[model samples]
Target: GSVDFAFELRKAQDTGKIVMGARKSIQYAKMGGAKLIIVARNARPDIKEDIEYYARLSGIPVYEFEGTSVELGTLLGRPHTVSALAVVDPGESRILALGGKE
Candidate 1:
């Protein structure tokens, strides 16, 4: 379910339904625009706590990406580390149905 759902995340990215980084994710999450949030295993504790708190309050589901931030960035086709990501619409991902279960 992990990789399969990540593929959906890729699709969502192509369609502009995804947001990257803790700041962006939290900004979007607070607006109730995020349907799901995924965090890299290596994210800082304080950053993770911040995102998770906003996510919980907004009723957004949080999922762990099962890899380091570098790896997560690669999965997203980025050259830099990506510690957090948010799926706003899930577009074609149906990532919400998948529920971030690794």
Candidate 2:
């Protein structure tokens, strides 16, 4: 079966540390240590472009969450919308498994 993206995201959040914000996502993406990135479909083009560039250079996988910032934010249980986020550590979640999937 295909990996459950949302379920894995919640599991990652519950068991590990996910860095929030577009800038922060860029930060880790540049470092090349971030396991993955989830970008909102509605994120600003400029910010999204920057993230993709750095993530590309660093060989990181960027997962486009099929939703707006508001929906992505709500999925992570955040009050404010999130443009992007980085998974610093996946802990017990199999989210890292997504890296080679799609």
Candidate 3:
């Protein structure tokens, strides 16, 4: 069975524990405590590489969001586009179920 990770991401947003955008997400990932990082499928190569690098070093998992950057922002209830998101706490989201897939 597959769960909708995007909806789960919205649930996490309600908890106010996420950091959005490439710069901030990478920053949070590097500082530690970010459980997971989710990036848009079409994220810029440089941004994706940066997040991947820090996530690897920080021992955090990164998931490629199945949608476009605009879609990602809409899911998170934002007007602007989002290339990346850092989830510190899942807030009851089943997104954690995807851990092994990484």
Candidate 4:
């Protein structure tokens, strides 16, 4: 019952702004600068929990994607692995409609 949110993620990347990496995402979460946060499935548990903690406190939604770090990086057009990605703006993508639950 799921679609390829990866494509929508790409749309968000092309048209919107995303902050990559755990540290940056945590900062964005604390600052409430991001509307949504995504953590790769294979990311370190500590990092994921840390990101989620801040996101919860800030009231930002967190989407735990099923992809690994490498796949996330590839999708985001990055050369390095990406454990976390924070969507500052979804722009034309319907990513925000996900509400982090999907």
Candidate 5:
């Protein structure tokens, strides 16, 4: 099944499955097992600032996509999200390994 990354995030958050913050998200990615972390194009400076740094430290790649907080929230089924991380299974490695580097 094709998983709508944003939609899954909202489901996770609604069920209290989301971990707020870059550090926590990274940690969750490591422990909870995340494949890729999606960052909103217009995320807060502090959150964006922390994303790259933590991603590097955690050995995870972050993608900055074209979307607003509202767009992301609406698309993902979340109330609000300046940034959302997707914690996927190890088999999803291909997506993460590709990262956002073109």
Candidate 6:
């Protein structure tokens, strides 16, 4: 499943970890060993730019979700989120498989 920061935060909160902001989420993605990146619609230019830079450096695919921060947060059961990145092998399955098809 795709990683949703707000959703993850809620889950984290249950574990006593309160995620404070998008930067923290980004750090989590980096630490979680994410392979694909998804940027929320309401992401700020700088944050979006940072994610783009990381994606390029990591050679990962990045997508933009459609919705406001509040809307996305509500959908994810949190306050807000700038984006989310998937932590998994990019080429293990047809759907998530990266690189050109053989």
TM-score of each: 0.84, 0.87, 0.87, 0.88, 0.59, 0.53
* Alpha-carbon lDDT, every model: 0.79, 0.83, 0.80, 0.83, 0.56, 0.50
At residue 78, give the lDDT of candidate 1. 66
Give lDDT tens digits, candidate 4, residues 3-44.
457767888888998788778888888777688889998999
Report how far residue 55 has shifted in candidate 3, in Å.
0.5
* True-vs-predicted CA distance for residue 26, candidate 4, Å: 0.9
lDDT of 6 by residue, 1-102 (tens): 565444443443454333334675466445444444556667787887876676656665555656666665665465644344343343323222321223
Better candidate by lDDT, 1 or 3: 3
- Candidate 2 local lDDT, 75-97, one digit each (tens): 88777898998877888778877
Show model 6 residue runs off by greater than 4 Å: 1-21, 28-32, 81-102
- Using TM-score as the measure, name the better of candidate 2 and candidate 5: 2
Residues 1-102, candidate 5, lDDT per residue (tens digit)? 354554445554554334443456655544444556766677777776666566656766666656866676667555756365554442423434335365
lDDT of 3 by residue, 1-102 (tens): 358786677777776477887788888778777777888888898888988888878888888888888988888866789899888788777675664263
Of the pair 5 and 6, which is ahead by TM-score? 5
RMSD (CA, Å), candidate 1 to true, equals 2.5
- Where model 2 places Cα greater than 4 Å from the true spot, the runs are none
Q: Worst 10-residue stretch by lDDT in candidate 6?
A: 92-101
Candidate 4 ranges beyond 4 A from true positions: 1-3
lDDT of 2: 0.83
Q: Count the backbone clashes (under 3 Å) in each candidate.
A: 0, 0, 0, 0, 3, 0
Which one wins by TM-score: 1 or 3? 3
